Design an enzyme around this catalytic site. Structure first.
Site, PDB file in Angstrom:
ATOM      1  CG  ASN A 104       1.274  11.416  -4.425  1.00  0.00           C
ATOM      2  OD1 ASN A 104       0.031  11.839  -4.053  1.00  0.00           O
ATOM      3  ND2 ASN A 104       2.416  11.364  -3.742  1.00  0.00           N
ATOM      4  CG  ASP A 194      -1.773  16.842  -1.571  1.00  0.00           C
ATOM      5  OD1 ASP A 194      -1.843  15.818  -2.290  1.00  0.00           O
ATOM      6  OD2 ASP A 194      -1.683  18.002  -1.929  1.00  0.00           O
ATOM      7  CG  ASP A 202      -2.406  21.909  -7.129  1.00  0.00           C
ATOM      8  OD1 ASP A 202      -3.634  21.659  -7.263  1.00  0.00           O
ATOM      9  OD2 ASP A 202      -2.350  23.040  -6.391  1.00  0.00           O
ATOM     10  CG  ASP A 231       2.302   4.145  -5.881  1.00  0.00           C
ATOM     11  OD1 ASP A 231       2.379   3.577  -5.095  1.00  0.00           O
ATOM     12  OD2 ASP A 231       2.780   5.266  -5.880  1.00  0.00           O
ATOM     13  CG  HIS A 235      -0.458   9.694  -0.085  1.00  0.00           C
ATOM     14  ND1 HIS A 235      -0.433  10.326   1.420  1.00  0.00           N
ATOM     15  CD2 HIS A 235       0.013   8.647   0.001  1.00  0.00           C
ATOM     16  CE1 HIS A 235       0.195   9.244   2.000  1.00  0.00           C
ATOM     17  NE2 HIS A 235       0.385   8.252   1.296  1.00  0.00           N
ATOM     18  CD  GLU A 261      -0.136   1.596  -1.630  1.00  0.00           C
ATOM     19  OE1 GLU A 261       0.675   1.369  -0.789  1.00  0.00           O
ATOM     20  OE2 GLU A 261       0.280   2.464  -2.615  1.00  0.00           O
TER      21      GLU A 261
END
Ligand code: NA
Ligand code: NA
Ligand code: NA
Length: 480
Positions: A104, A194, A202, A231, A235, A261
């Site tokens: 992320n 996000d 991105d 993980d 997001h 998750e």
């Protein structure tokens, strides 16, 4: 041979930063297997923001505690060689290895870059609250000490779309890079969720998509993984996680179990995500986590008939990874929803002795959490693992018919000798309940593996037995 699977998160937030964890894992392999553990979820194994980083402040995904970066060679857990040695030990002891995957964001950039950005409403990232201006963001990654081993890819601000810190004026704000869009689709809490922390990746960039797919394959092959723990996926743009997962399974010969998750106390949100994934992975049962927490917090007044209501395991047992607590829910952490000692045994029995769901044991519960004076529950857990590993087989019968006392049974299977069990518990005053365990078990005398009740239960001629439980307790009877 058809043995039930049981996962274990092998770490807790406050583990000591002594760099001996991979070695501990290696020496614990045989014991964990004998106890009934069949899969291990290891913490992020790559170089984080600093040596003591638990692993989520991921700096360099290609540095598995092998290069001198961020003030250390080893990660908090140890060196690359000790991890590989630990993994070999796990394989030889028939334990699958799932690697935690953090894609992320990135943290610990080597230098700042000037970036046009705009401040956004923290509770609605779709709304700017400032005009665009130039900030200095920590987005430049050179991985100096790695010397381009494995990959010469370098990260820059244009690979990200946001940060929460401006080094130019030294201020915290949720920043969206001007002329960049928040990823989509992602969770909608706060409008667009996000951005969480660090430098937000991105994925709209093809080079980014390919880099992480290639890194994933490299990581998978390097450690010979059997799966991943994804993980903070709520997001990460849903479309990409799907692409990524499909890509990994395409590049690897071995099977790859995947558990994401998606942290949200809303089973519908999780089901939505699984629809988008075409159900190609499982998700941690976060709603069940909160069900356990609500029960732990409320006490006996909690109606046990609803303990599984709203859970993911209740609706899609095949796609749910059940757990009681993790590094995020333990005391003092960001997603605190800690299940107290009194209710913990009931929660573990629920995920370990039922047919649905892929249960996960938390290191913190198994070995305790010294930092907070939390005792090791190894004794209690091992008895429930014994139950799962050797007795939790065959047709299941549920009895969630009382607000305090509930239970279920497993008739056992011909494939496993003397398998079969009856779980009964109460979050309030004690009691008993007649339950069917299979006429094929008639005449047998069952006793409590947990030792919480000395009652001896003989199954009658119709396959029925009356099982007892004390108040705020759980018992698991088997033909031992
Ligand atoms: Na994100
Ligand atoms: Na919890
Ligand atoms: Na109750």
């Amino acid at each position: 041979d058809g043995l039930n699977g049981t996962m274990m998160q092998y770490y807790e937030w406050h583990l000591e930063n002594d760099g001996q964890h991979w070695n501990r894992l290696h020496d614990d392999a045989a014991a964990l297997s004998d106890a009934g553990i069949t899969a291990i979820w290891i913490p992020p194994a790559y170089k984080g923001n600093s040596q003591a980083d638990v692993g989520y402040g991921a700096y360099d995904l290609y540095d598995l505690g092998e290069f001198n970066q961020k003030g250390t060679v080893r990660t908090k857990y140890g060196t690359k060689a000790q991890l590989e040695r630990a993994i070999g030990s796990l394989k030889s002891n028939d334990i699958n290895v799932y690697g935690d995957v953090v894609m992320n964001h990135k943290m610990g950039a080597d230098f700042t870059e000037a970036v046009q950005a705009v401040q956004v409403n923290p509770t609605n990232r779709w709304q700017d609250i400032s005009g665009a201006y130039t900030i200095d963001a920590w987005t430049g990654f050179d991985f100096s000490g790695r010397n381009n081993a494995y990959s010469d890819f370098k990260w820059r601000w244009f690979h990200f779309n946001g940060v929460d810190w401006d080094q130019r004026y030294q201020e915290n704000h949720i920043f969206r890079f001007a002329n960049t869009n928040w990823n989509w689709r992602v969770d909608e809490e706060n409008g667009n969720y996000d951005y969480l922390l660090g430098s937000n990746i991105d994925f709209s960039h093809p080079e980014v998509q390919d880099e992480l797919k290639d890194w994933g394959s490299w990581f998978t092959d390097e450690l010979d993984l059997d799966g991943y723990r994804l993980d903070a996926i709520k997001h990460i743009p849903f479309w990409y996680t799907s692409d990524w997962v499909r890509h990994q399974r395409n590049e690897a010969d071995q099977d790859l179990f995947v558990v994401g998750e998606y942290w949200k106390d809303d089973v519908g949100a999780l089901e939505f995500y699984l629809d988008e994934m075409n159900w190609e992975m499982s998700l941690f049962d976060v709603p069940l986590n909160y069900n356990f927490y609500r029960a732990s917090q409320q006490g006996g007044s909690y109606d046990m008939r609803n303990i599984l209501r709203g859970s993911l395991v209740e609706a899609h047992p095949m796609h749910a990874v059940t757990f009681v607590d993790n590094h995020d829910t333990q005391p003092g952490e960001s997603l605190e929803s800690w299940v107290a000692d009194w209710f913990k045994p009931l929660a573990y029995a629920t995920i370990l002795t039922r047919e649905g769901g892929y249960p996960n044991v938390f290191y913190g519960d198994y070995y305790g959490i010294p930092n907070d004076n939390i005792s090791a529950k190894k004794d209690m857990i091992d008895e429930l693992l014994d139950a799962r590993q050797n007795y939790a087989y065959g047709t299941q019968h549920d009895y969630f018919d009382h607000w305090d006392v509930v239970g279920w049974t497993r008739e056992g299977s011909s494939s496993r000798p003397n398998s079969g069990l009856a779980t009964i518990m109460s979050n309030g005053p004690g009691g008993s309940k007649w339950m069917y365990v299979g006429r094929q078990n008639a005449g047998q005398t069952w006793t409590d593996l947990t030792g919480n009740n000395g009652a001896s239960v003989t199954i009658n001629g119709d396959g029925w037995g009356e099982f007892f439980t004390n108040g705020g307790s759980v018992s698991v009877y088997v033909n031992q």
